[PDB]
């Protein structure tokens, strides 16, 4: 597209990830590996607004970015994930989300969006790019047989609609989460996915700020694989570029010339999973291609790092109330701490196995 949200902007680096990374690197004993680890703080990542408690942080990041831009003559861009749906993660064994459909979920989520909008509105000289609700709409394509997902469908659609409609009013550039090649990229899932995303785009008024879709968020697929990972057998769309090439024209036909962003933050090492669906703390992952608008595809605005490598996907402790057994599988690094919290050994390996090397 003509308007790539990133061109001409300086990405605001996360101070939290810089702070997680800074504390992490000083624990790495090899001096050369430690220096590589510290440099990860210079690589832009997305900030996850996974609870209302994160919203004051958003306000500080916008204000800090505004001042940094003035001090350097740059226009700054803040990268966020909207991630607080009621009954979040409907197909997962466990979820950390603070809101439930049964307890005024829709109103509480709307208030979460309103608080985010109220922050963004105060800093018009800062651009915002948002990934909208990982692990939400994709479940409404393939997982309607999961009863929690069937029961969440109307709330997910209404809440995502509220987010899109209201973030558009403050000019936020938005990419809806769209799973990955091994989820929605199966040829038979492409058209049901396109139909759902198009309906969502229509309900939110077809705003030009709804740029398209985000793929591979918190996952490990290649953007362009040298050879198909054996986990992909049966699916001709074995990497993200195949998925995107196949999905994009379906959206274009609907009048939505959509573009895409692709997470590569944990994609440096391929061929590390037993089954494609294994998503939790996959052992041996390495940092992948650094964020760039040099994407290799007409459809892709940017390679991005959405999931911050080093933060756990979930605990391996089967006694935790938030325990998801996916996190105890043979290909999951164990022992692992609670989701979102720092996983030092995993981070160290992400650095060691980075590809391209750091």
State how far the Cα of 4 lies from the Cα of 343, in Å rounded to an integer: 34
State how far the Cα of 310 lies from the Cα of 296, in Å rounded to an integer: 27
Nearest to 203 by CA among 172, 170, 176, 243: 176
Give the angle 334-224-195 at the CA atoms, nearest 5°: 90
Residue 212: how many other CB atoms lie within 10 Å: 26
Q: Is 288 exposed, middle or buried (0-12, 13-18, 19+ CB in 10 A)?
A: buried
Token match 């109103």: residue? 107
CATH of domain 10-352: 3.20.20.40
Token match 């074995």: residue? 238
The experimental resolution of this structure, in angstroms, equals 0.9
Is 125 in the active site?
Answer: no
The structure was resolved experimentally with: X-ray
Nearest to 310 by CA among 263, 354, 351, 268: 351
Q: Give the sign of the dihedral formed by CA 348, CA 351, CA 261, CA 62.
A: positive
Which CA distances in Å does 32 have to 98, 109, 345, 353, 357?
A: 41, 45, 16, 14, 12
Catalytic residue among 87, 135, 177, 263: 135
Q: Output helix, strand, coil percentages for the chain, rounded to the nearest 5.
A: 35, 10, 50
Token couple for 126:
């800062």
Coil, helix or strand at residue 188: helix
Residue 23: how many other CB atoms lie within 10 Å: 11
- Supply the DSSP string of 272-306, one letter for each residue: --SSTT--SSBTT----SPPBS--SSTTEEEEE--
Catalytic residue among 229, 239, 313, 324: 313
Domain ranges (residues) in the chain: 10-352
Q: Strands, E, within the chain: which ranges? A: 10-11, 47-49, 76-82, 127-132, 173-177, 210-215, 259-263, 300-304
Is 177 in the active site?
Answer: no
């Amino acid at each position: 597209s003509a308007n790539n949200p990133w061109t001409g902007f300086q990405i605001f680096l996360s101070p939290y990830y810089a702070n997680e990374v800074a504390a992490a690197a000083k624990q790495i004993t090899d001096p050369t590996l430690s220096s590589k680890a510290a440099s990860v703080a210079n690589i832009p990542t997305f900030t996850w607004l996974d609870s209302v408690a994160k919203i004051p942080d958003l306000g500080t990041y916008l204000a800090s970015a505004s001042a940094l831009g003035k001090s350097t003559g740059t226009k700054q861009l803040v990268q966020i994930v909207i991630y607080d749906l009621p009954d979040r993660n409907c197909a997962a064994k466990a979820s950390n989300g603070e809101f439930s459909i049964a307890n005024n979920g829709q109103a509480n989520y709307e208030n979460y969006i309103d608080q985010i909008v109220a922050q963004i509105q105060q800093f018009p000289d800062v651009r915002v790019v948002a990934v909208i609700e990982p692990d939400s709409l994709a479940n409404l394509v393939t997982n309607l047989n999961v009863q929690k997902c069937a029961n969440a469908k109307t709330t997910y659609l209404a809440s995502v609609n509220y987010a899109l409609t209201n973030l558009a009013k403050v000019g936020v550039y938005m990419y809806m989460d769209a799973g990955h090649a091994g989820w929605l990229g199966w040829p038979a899932n492409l058209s049901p996915a396109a139909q759902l995303f198009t309906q969502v785009w229509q309900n939110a008024g077809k705003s030009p700020f709804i740029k398209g879709l985000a793929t591979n968020v918190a996952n490990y697929n290649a953007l362009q694989a040298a050879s198909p990972d054996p986990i992909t057998q049966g699916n001709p769309n074995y990497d993200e570029i195949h998925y995107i090439n196949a999905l994009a024209p379906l959206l274009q036909q609907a009048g939505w010339d959509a573009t895409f962003i692709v997470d590569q933050g944990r994609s440096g090492v391929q061929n590390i999973r037993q089954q494609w669906g294994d998503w939790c703390n996959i052992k041996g992952a390495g940092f992948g291609t650094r964020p760039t608008t040099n994407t290799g595809s007409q459809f892709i605005d940017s390679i991005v790092w959405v999931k911050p490598g080093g933060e756990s996907d979930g605990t391996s402790n089967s006694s935790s109330p938030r325990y998801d057994s996916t996190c105890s599988l043979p290909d999951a690094a164990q022992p692992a701490p609670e989701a979102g919290t720092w996983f030092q050994a995993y981070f160290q390996t992400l650095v060691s196995a980075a590809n391209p090397p750091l």
